[PDB]
Amino acid sequence: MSLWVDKYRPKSLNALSHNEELTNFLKSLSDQPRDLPHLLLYGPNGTGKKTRCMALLESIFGPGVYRLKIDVRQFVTASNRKLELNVVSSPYHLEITPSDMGNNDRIVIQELLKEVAQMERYKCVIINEANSLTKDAQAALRRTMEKYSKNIRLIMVCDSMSPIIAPIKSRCLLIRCPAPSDSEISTILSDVVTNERIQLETKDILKRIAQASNGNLRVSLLMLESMALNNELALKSSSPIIKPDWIIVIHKLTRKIVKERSVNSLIECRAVLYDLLAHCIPANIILKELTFSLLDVETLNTTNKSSIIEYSSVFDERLSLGNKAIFHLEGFIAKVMCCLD
Amino acid sequence: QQPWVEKYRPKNLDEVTAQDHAVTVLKKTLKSANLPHMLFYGPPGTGKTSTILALTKELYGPDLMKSRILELNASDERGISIVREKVKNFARLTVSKPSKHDLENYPCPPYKIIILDEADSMTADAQSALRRTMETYSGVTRFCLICNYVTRIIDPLASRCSKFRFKALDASNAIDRLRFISEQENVKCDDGVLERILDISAGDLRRGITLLQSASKGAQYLGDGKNITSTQVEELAGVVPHDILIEIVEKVKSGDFDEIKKYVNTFMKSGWSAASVVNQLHEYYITNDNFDTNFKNQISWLLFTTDSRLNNGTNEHIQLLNLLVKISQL
Amino acid sequence: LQLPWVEKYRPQVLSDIVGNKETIDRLQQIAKDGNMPHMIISGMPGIGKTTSVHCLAHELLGRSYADGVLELNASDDRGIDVVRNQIKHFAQKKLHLPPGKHKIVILDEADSMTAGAQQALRRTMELYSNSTRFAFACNQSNKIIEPLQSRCAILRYSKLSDEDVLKRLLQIIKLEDVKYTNDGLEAIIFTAEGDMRQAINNLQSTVAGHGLVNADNVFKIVDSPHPLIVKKMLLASNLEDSIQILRTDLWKKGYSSIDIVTTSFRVTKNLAQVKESVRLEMIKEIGLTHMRILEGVGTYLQLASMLAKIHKLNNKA
Amino acid sequence: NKFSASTVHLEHITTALSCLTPFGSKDDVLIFIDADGLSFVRENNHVIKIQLLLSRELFMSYSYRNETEDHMKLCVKINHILDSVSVMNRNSDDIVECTLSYDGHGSPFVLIFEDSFISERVEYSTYLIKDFDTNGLELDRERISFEAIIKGEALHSALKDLKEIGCKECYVYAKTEANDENVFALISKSQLGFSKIKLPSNRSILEKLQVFDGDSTTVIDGFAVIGFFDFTSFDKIRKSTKIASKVLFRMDVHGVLSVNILSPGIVIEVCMLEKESIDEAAQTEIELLMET
Amino acid sequence: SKENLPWVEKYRPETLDEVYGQNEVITTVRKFVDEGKLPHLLFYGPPGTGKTSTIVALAREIYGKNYSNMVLELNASDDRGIDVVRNQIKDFASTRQIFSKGFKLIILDEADAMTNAAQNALRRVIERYTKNTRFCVLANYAHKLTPALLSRCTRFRFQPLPQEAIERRIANVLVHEKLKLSPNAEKALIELSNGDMRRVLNVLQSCKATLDNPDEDEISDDVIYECCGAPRPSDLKAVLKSILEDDWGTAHYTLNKVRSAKGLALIDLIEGIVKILEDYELQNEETRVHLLTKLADIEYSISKGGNDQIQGSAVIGAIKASFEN
Amino acid sequence: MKLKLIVNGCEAPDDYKLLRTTINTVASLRKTAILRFNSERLTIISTPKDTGQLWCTIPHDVFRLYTVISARELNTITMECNCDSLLSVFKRYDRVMNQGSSSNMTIKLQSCALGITFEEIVKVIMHSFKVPVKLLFRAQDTRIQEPMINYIQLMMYKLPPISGEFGSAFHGFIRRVERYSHIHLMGVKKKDVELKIIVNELDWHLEICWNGPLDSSTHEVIIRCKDWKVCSKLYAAFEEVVLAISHDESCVFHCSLDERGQIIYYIAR
Ligand SMILES: Nc1ncnc2c1ncn2[C@@H]1O[C@H](COP(=O)(O)OP(=O)(O)OP(O)(O)=S)[C@@H](O)[C@H]1O
Ligand SMILES: Nc1ncnc2c1ncn2[C@@H]1O[C@H](COP(=O)(O)OP(=O)(O)OP(O)(O)=S)[C@@H](O)[C@H]1O
Ligand SMILES: Nc1ncnc2c1ncn2[C@@H]1O[C@H](COP(=O)(O)OP(=O)(O)OP(O)(O)=S)[C@@H](O)[C@H]1O
Ligand SMILES: Nc1ncnc2c1ncn2[C@@H]1O[C@H](COP(=O)(O)OP(=O)(O)O)[C@@H](O)[C@H]1O
Ligand SMILES: [Mg+2]
Ligand SMILES: [Mg+2]
Numbered sequence A: 001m002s003l004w005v006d007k008y009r010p011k012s013l014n015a016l017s018h019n020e021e022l023t024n025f026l027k028s029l030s031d032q033p034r035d036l037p038h039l040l041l042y043g044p045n046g047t048g049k050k051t052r053c054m055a056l057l058e059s060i061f062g063p064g065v066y067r068l069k070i071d072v073r074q075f076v077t078a079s080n081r082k083l084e085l086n087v088v089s090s091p092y093h094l095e096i097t098p099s100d101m102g103n104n105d106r107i108v109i110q111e112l113l114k115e116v117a118q119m120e121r122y123k124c125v126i127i128n129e130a131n132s133l134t135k136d137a138q139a140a141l142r143r144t145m146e147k148y149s150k151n152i153r154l155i156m157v158c159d160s161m162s163p164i165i166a167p168i169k170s171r172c173l174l175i176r177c178p179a180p181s182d183s184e185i186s187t188i189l190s191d192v193v194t195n196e197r198i199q200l201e202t203k204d205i206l207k208r209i210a211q212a213s214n215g216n217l218r219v220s221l222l223m224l225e226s227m228a229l230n231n232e233l234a235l236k237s238s239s240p241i242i243k244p245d246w247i248i249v250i251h252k253l254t255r256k257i258v259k260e261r262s263v264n265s266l267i268e269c270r271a272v273l274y275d276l277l278a279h280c281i282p283a284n285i286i287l288k289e290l291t292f293s294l295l296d297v298e299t300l301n302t303t304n305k306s307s308i309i310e311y312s313s314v315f316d317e318r319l320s321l322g323n324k325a326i327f328h329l330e331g332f333i334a335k336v337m338c339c340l341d
Numbered sequence B: 001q002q003p004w005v006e007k008y009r010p011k012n013l014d015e016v017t018a019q020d021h022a023v024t025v026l027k028k029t030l031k032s033a034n035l036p037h038m039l040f041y042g043p044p045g046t047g048k049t050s051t052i053l054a055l056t057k058e059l060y061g062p063d064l065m066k067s068r069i070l071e072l073n074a075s076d077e078r079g080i081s082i083v084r085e086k087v088k089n090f091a092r093l094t095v096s097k098p099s100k101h102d103l104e105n106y107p108c109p110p111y112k113i114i115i116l117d118e119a120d121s122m123t124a125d126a127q128s129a130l131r132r133t134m135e136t137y138s139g140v141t142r143f144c145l146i147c148n149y150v151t152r153i154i155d156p157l158a159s160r161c162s163k164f165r166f167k168a169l170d171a172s173n174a175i176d177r178l179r180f181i182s183e184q185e186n187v188k189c190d191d192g193v194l195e196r197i198l199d200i201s202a203g204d205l206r207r208g209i210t211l212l213q214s215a216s217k218g219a220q221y222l223g224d225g226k227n228i229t230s231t232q233v234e235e236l237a238g239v240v241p242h243d244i245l246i247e248i249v250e251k252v253k254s255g256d257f258d259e260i261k262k263y264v265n266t267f268m269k270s271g272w273s274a275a276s277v278v279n280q281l282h283e284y285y286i287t288n289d290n291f292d293t294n295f296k297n298q299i300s301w302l303l304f305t306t307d308s309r310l311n312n313g314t315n316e317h318i319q320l321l322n323l324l325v326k327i328s329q330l
Numbered sequence C: 001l002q003l004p005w006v007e008k009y010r011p012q013v014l015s016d017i018v019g020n021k022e023t024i025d026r027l028q029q030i031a032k033d034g035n036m037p038h039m040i041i042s043g044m045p046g047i048g049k050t051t052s053v054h055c056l057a058h059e060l061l062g063r064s065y066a067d068g069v070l071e072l073n074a075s076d077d078r079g080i081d082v083v084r085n086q087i088k089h090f091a092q093k094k095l096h097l098p099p100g101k102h103k104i105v106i107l108d109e110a111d112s113m114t115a116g117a118q119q120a121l122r123r124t125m126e127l128y129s130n131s132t133r134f135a136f137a138c139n140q141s142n143k144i145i146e147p148l149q150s151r152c153a154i155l156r157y158s159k160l161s162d163e164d165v166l167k168r169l170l171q172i173i174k175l176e177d178v179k180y181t182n183d184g185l186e187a188i189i190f191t192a193e194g195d196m197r198q199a200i201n202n203l204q205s206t207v208a209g210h211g212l213v214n215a216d217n218v219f220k221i222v223d224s225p226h227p228l229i230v231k232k233m234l235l236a237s238n239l240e241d242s243i244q245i246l247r248t249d250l251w252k253k254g255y256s257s258i259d260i261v262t263t264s265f266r267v268t269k270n271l272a273q274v275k276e277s278v279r280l281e282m283i284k285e286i287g288l289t290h291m292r293i294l295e296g297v298g299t300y301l302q303l304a305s306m307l308a309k310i311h312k313l314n315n316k317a
Numbered sequence D: 001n002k003f004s005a006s007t008v009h010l011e012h013i014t015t016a017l018s019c020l021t022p023f024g025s026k027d028d029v030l031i032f033i034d035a036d037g038l039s040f041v042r043e044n045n046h047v048i049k050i051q052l053l054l055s056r057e058l059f060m061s062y063s064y065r066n067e068t069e070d071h072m073k074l075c076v077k078i079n080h081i082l083d084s085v086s087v088m089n090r091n092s093d094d095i096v097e098c099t100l101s102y103d104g105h106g107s108p109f110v111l112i113f114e115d116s117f118i119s120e121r122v123e124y125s126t127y128l129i130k131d132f133d134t135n136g137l138e139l140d141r142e143r144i145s146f147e148a149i150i151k152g153e154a155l156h157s158a159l160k161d162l163k164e165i166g167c168k169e170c171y172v173y174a175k176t177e178a179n180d181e182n183v184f185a186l187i188s189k190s191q192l193g194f195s196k197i198k199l200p201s202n203r204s205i206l207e208k209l210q211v212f213d214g215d216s217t218t219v220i221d222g223f224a225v226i227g228f229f230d231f232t233s234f235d236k237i238r239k240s241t242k243i244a245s246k247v248l249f250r251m252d253v254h255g256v257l258s259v260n261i262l263s264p265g266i267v268i269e270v271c272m273l274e275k276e277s278i279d280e281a282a283q284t285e286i287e288l289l290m291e292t
Numbered sequence E: 001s002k003e004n005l006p007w008v009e010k011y012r013p014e015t016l017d018e019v020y021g022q023n024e025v026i027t028t029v030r031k032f033v034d035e036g037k038l039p040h041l042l043f044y045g046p047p048g049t050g051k052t053s054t055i056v057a058l059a060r061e062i063y064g065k066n067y068s069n070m071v072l073e074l075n076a077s078d079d080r081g082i083d084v085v086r087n088q089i090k091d092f093a094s095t096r097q098i099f100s101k102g103f104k105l106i107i108l109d110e111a112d113a114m115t116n117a118a119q120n121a122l123r124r125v126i127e128r129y130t131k132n133t134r135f136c137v138l139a140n141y142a143h144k145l146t147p148a149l150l151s152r153c154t155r156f157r158f159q160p161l162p163q164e165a166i167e168r169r170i171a172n173v174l175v176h177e178k179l180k181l182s183p184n185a186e187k188a189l190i191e192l193s194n195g196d197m198r199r200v201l202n203v204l205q206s207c208k209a210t211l212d213n214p215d216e217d218e219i220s221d222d223v224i225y226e227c228c229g230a231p232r233p234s235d236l237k238a239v240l241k242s243i244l245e246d247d248w249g250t251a252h253y254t255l256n257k258v259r260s261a262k263g264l265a266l267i268d269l270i271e272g273i274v275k276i277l278e279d280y281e282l283q284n285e286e287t288r289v290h291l292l293t294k295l296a297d298i299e300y301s302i303s304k305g306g307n308d309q310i311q312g313s314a315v316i317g318a319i320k321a322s323f324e325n
Numbered sequence F: 001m002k003l004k005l006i007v008n009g010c011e012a013p014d015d016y017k018l019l020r021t022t023i024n025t026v027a028s029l030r031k032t033a034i035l036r037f038n039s040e041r042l043t044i045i046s047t048p049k050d051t052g053q054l055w056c057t058i059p060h061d062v063f064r065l066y067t068v069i070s071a072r073e074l075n076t077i078t079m080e081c082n083c084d085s086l087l088s089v090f091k092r093y094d095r096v097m098n099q100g101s102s103s104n105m106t107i108k109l110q111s112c113a114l115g116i117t118f119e120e121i122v123k124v125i126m127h128s129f130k131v132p133v134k135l136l137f138r139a140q141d142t143r144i145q146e147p148m149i150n151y152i153q154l155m156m157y158k159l160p161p162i163s164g165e166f167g168s169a170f171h172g173f174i175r176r177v178e179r180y181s182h183i184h185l186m187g188v189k190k191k192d193v194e195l196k197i198i199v200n201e202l203d204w205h206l207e208i209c210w211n212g213p214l215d216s217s218t219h220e221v222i223i224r225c226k227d228w229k230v231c232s233k234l235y236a237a238f239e240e241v242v243l244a245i246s247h248d249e250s251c252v253f254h255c256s257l258d259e260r261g262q263i264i265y266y267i268a269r
């Protein structure tokens, strides 16, 4: 098929190449599915928490977990505004699509969790990216898992679980999924290239891919895919590690900020920021990447770096409550220019 | 069967372990019919829902659950009009007629109880509309408000409803309860596992019960017959090891930005929650007696600011890096 | 059945109305001439706008105004269709009016009337302005759409001076034959702040609750206005004096925190002695305290922190 | 069951309850249960009160088992009761039986219907928390301004014409004549102008009309009584007089109006509240224009 | 009717003489109704002052048997829109008398939640129909009311209940049910009242259930402080002394021991510290500014939630650092 | 694109043909309806996506001179037209039931318009009405909008057309529910069976129990919306008997059988 992300995906629970402590812990959890409480997974993005959830479902239910079952449901909010959600269905479990807007998120969650509950074995619900809720959907999930804790199980995967409210963190078991080290990523890549028998003279490129993706399985696999198809399935030690337009644009913006510090530079930074933000993206990761790229400049000293990180934290706090993002982004950029100049 | 959180949920008023005052007030109310409006508040997972359910079970009974009890939550629509009409309709219904069996067995009060959970997330207009319904219709009905945020409830509601604070379930407040649960479920602890679980838990018993259940499941799966140690519950609780915290403190002590940033990145790629790291760093810094007063005050202020930032739904990596940089430069 | 002084002693002719000599003289002149075009009357409430309009209509028409006009106020269904139909019928039905007289459409509290009704009124004027004229009684002219005001002569009523309110108070006192004290009258004027209706209500309350009108009785029944107290609080030099004033004037008197914040914001908007930077800093602090109050924290500590931060930004170390 | 009432002819109950439908947002009826019978009273904004009385002889199984002061109350909805009895009693020779039950206090209002081996049981929970009791827009008969007895058909035509034309404000005129030329009409003012619905003066359908001097015994001729009534109050009695035989009009000097509807037959009593004051001095021109 | 209701709705005044504290307002209203003139009374004040109880008692005293018909009660419980004020209020305030020529009273309880258009319609109603009907407006926030309405309504300020009114009501409650209360507990209840009758009644109802024997015993400071959970003044003084003389170790240990001995809350400790520090003499004003700002920030953070140990150490550090000036 | 057929008066199929009009009022009130003309005697029409499913077949074999042909390759052709204009042709044809048998109903598919020919006589009057829109859809939408769905078990056989009071009871449910403005059903396998409908509200407790009706696992509790008011109108079916099936606690069907064709309605949870 198309990508290594979904093709050579670990099917069975015994086919995990990562650390065995988490696998043993979830095997202990899956030993008695009747006594299994509500579960919450937190860790770095791209670690593969959904893979652990699918493996746990395989251990509890059995074969047939992966079923397409594309379904479309209609939901009505207050006044009159039709909403559409391409929620994915499956036997014995269902996954929630968080693609809906945060403001009108109560109706879909309430209706679909009531539909999965009914009155009646149990059916499990997987809710990815639970941090996007405005605490109203969080309260809805809290009440649903409190009152109907007889036939429903919630298994949520998320990264940077701080916005998740305290009551939910108390009622759900905390699963930690640390990102694999460079050795495990290199072993996985070696297994892949042995499976397809592609050309490979030096293993240093595998370590470069492993360490350049910051411990992300999907990013490393896709980076391997990009260079393999562009080199006629023949990796070379002299082949540079390519990066998306995202990192190139971020680095160019950082270089422009460091070099040129002026109002004209500020409005070109505004144009670049608008061009980036035109692709339906959150600004927290953009601010984090800009801060990390600014701290990577060798010409800066410790005082400028300290000021940059302090104002980055302050403007991230401002963005946490702010409705817009361009205000805080431009404020952080202007503060960085003021500090550098 | 059932998870230990719901399997061991109290069903009687005397099954509580720490909230003595509210429970004994309700018990002395059981022989009377002058129950006032109650405002239950406190830390999460202190058993306010369990307490109100036990009180309702002692008062009315399963026959009168479906006739004299209305519960409104966030699971359905909670608009101004819907809440207004529903509360006006239910708070106007006449006194129900219990059977002779109910009167013979349980003391049936002549009033009805309306329970409104998570009242903190209710709009001010709804509370203003419900003020007069609570006041002038209270002859044969009562309202119970349960919320973990007192400030989210406006001043007039805090006056009509009796304020029943729920104490934080500390170590000694739940040692006996965890011991009873361990004996009932055959869970073995060596010296201080239960005390360690309550120390880890933020003043609640539900998280501790879940942690104990996870530890018991792990011990049963291991099958070697040994007892649970403090290291196991610390690992399953997300507690940072002491050696790694010592390494963090040592790297912060050195005044270099590059090594600190690299180690912060290496720590964040492990996916550890920053709140636990902040708490462990704070308790280590206060516990240590090698620092003077000004440094302790400054680091306490920075830790409080970082905790507020983290609780405000911000990024853990940036906040922890900023906190460690600020600490290193003191 | 004792009718209250606000309704019992309301003026019936334009002669008894005081406060704006030029405007009353203009109204008398335009009534004597009779050529009264459309107009909009706006001002702060309690200055004598709608009663002036009613008196002008009275002494301009008489029996014709009493029997054959259609006066609409805010206590009616002010929908687009029904108002359109009603004014359309009222534009018709002409009588044997004098050549220098025209029908008057009294419009009381038109600030809350929908824009479609304003457009319907525009069409009604442009179609039958020859037979009838429109009179507008409102608080501010901003709520009236732009095209309506182009067809009318806007008249603005200034705030009543102390002399006119004092003269009206003496006339009402002579009519009622009640003892008074100059200190009590000065206190009544100070509490009214140019509000005639508030002054009448305060004087009536003093007379009916204590008898002789005195400064002590007025201060007992009603305290000083909160804008003055807040203005004195914001201009205090020492923080301890400001804290004591705040406590003993609003916390011990039963004043809500959100009302205190709103009054502080209103005072800071209209303050003039402070610099622009100080004014904007105080506005920012007031807004921060307001959002803290709205989010739930409504304790005295927030007000104390606001006062402390205001004093800190005023002193600037 | 502490209450029993069996009804076969549900058409009479259907048309009786249909007289209370013009009330907007119909609810909160204070049904009275007594040995004399069942009386339904409904008030809207404490300005108009209507009482509908059902006699004991109307029900063939009236028992009223009680050991109290014979004054018991319950509050339920109108729209539930109004649509409860109208749905059945269809086809021919169905002899539908309606059963009323109420277990004293705190029990739902039980309605049982039987129609060709088909059984229903409808329960209405009562609202008896803040029943203020007392109430009543009654009046004393010692100071009745005037009394009038008119046919239902004559008044129904006047009210029907009064509604569709509009006439948000209506006037009631009463005037006697020594030559037995009594004058009584329902005139009103609207956007159309002046409407004069002059009721007939002959004895064919106007049984009696006399004007008192505030003593209810001293009849006086040539005096005029002017009543200023809201249109909303008149719209409620329009359908009540649609099916009626005789309509009785009685008002006092205090301004309240009592309307008795006769249709043994049942009696419907409607009480109304006069408006504040006559617009301008229209009481002068009402006498002047009608006399012309 | 009695012995079946909460203590809040058990001692509600029924006559004008049963309302304490606002003696001037009661006397002025009594003079108003003795003369026979109601100047559109408007009641403003904090909750628990007794505005609605006073106005209901006054209406009962004026009317008697006419309360059911001629008196109209309005609130936020029922719908109050533009149509409601346009139709129901206009219809009610347009009728004549029935048995007595007394005025018509309409009770606008918690009227601050009405819309601006509804408020404008309401004030055009009060101006037009004032010759027979006088409205009464009850609200707690004057900023939500249209300023034109305040001009047409006689504003009366409801001050917080003084010490003598609270003591008189406490004595009346004790005499009715034959309950003994210690003077120290009386002073504690005076301090905790903060001018609120509902709070006093609610805590008095719960303290009755706290005692094992309802009679033949008294209520001391320990029972009062255990019932509601408020910190003892001695505990607050000890905490402040430990913070002042001990820097972090034994001070933090003492704070933790105090908080864990009974289950004290951080918020109530914060009001205790600010109450015992308001009378302190600090002639620098920078310590005062720092204390107020940092304590307000900590209270806001606690209201938003967080770690109890972190916030307690923040309070300790703020108090120690501010006093260093 | 030749879609030409003739509809003529008769004795038996007119009641089946006049039964089509009742939905047309509802279908016009709804969004629209789809059509699929196949072969010479099979065509399926339903309401596209509430949950309005009205799979119903009509035996066009008895119809005279009917032929379907289109450029849709396979035997199934997507067809859709607005049902509001269908009322006009049926209502006006219903007024001429007094006289006129040779008028017929000539329909011609031309491109968008469907001319309808009338030959009513009062000296003859010719009427030529045209259907406004016959717009088709995507060929792939035919598979995703398949209306053929049926279930088994828990068969309630309705009361045979001997007593007319059974239909009036269902017609009573039509008028009452419109006047108030959830519905619960019961099912039992104990022999004739009994039908029970119960409505639960805050203060409205309606329950109807049938003592001795002639209609024919257990405890099939189900909670559904008020969309069943349509299905009661389909029960009339004076020519034949109607079937009803309800099970699985989530879905219910109303199998209306008349002549060869059958009509079913689907209700979701
Ligand atoms: N006093 C107690 N004794 C024993 N178990 C308790 C006690 N209080 C709470 N629990 C346990 O806590 C759980 C019930 O707590 P909940 O009532 O659901 O939490 P909570 O009080 O609703 O907190 P919220 O609603 O999130 S603020 C059960 O597992 C109980 O066993
Ligand atoms: N110049 C004046 N002389 C005497 N009485 C006055 C004067 N102006 C106002 N009043 C009194 O004010 C009361 C009502 O005045 P209004 O005209 O209704 O107030 P207003 O200025 O129109 O403000 P609004 O918009 O109507 S609330 C009556 O009792 C009048 O007697
Ligand atoms: N002066 C008083 N004397 C005696 N009891 C009082 C007094 N003021 C209040 N109370 C009691 O407090 C209870 C509640 O106060 P209410 O008068 O009903 O409401 P309120 O004080 O007006 O505050 P709001 O504005 O309605 S929230 C009353 O039922 C009385 O029992
Ligand atoms: N134990 C494992 N061994 C090999 N690959 C793994 C393992 N766990 C996860 N992966 C890889 O992770 C990818 C899926 O990651 P995903 O679940 O999308 O991460 P996240 O849950 O953070 O979004 C798969 O393509 C799979 O190859
Ligand atoms: Mg709960
Ligand atoms: Mg005016």
Ligand SMILES: [Mg+2]
Pocket: E051, E052, E053, E109, E110, E138
């Ligand atoms: Mg009140």
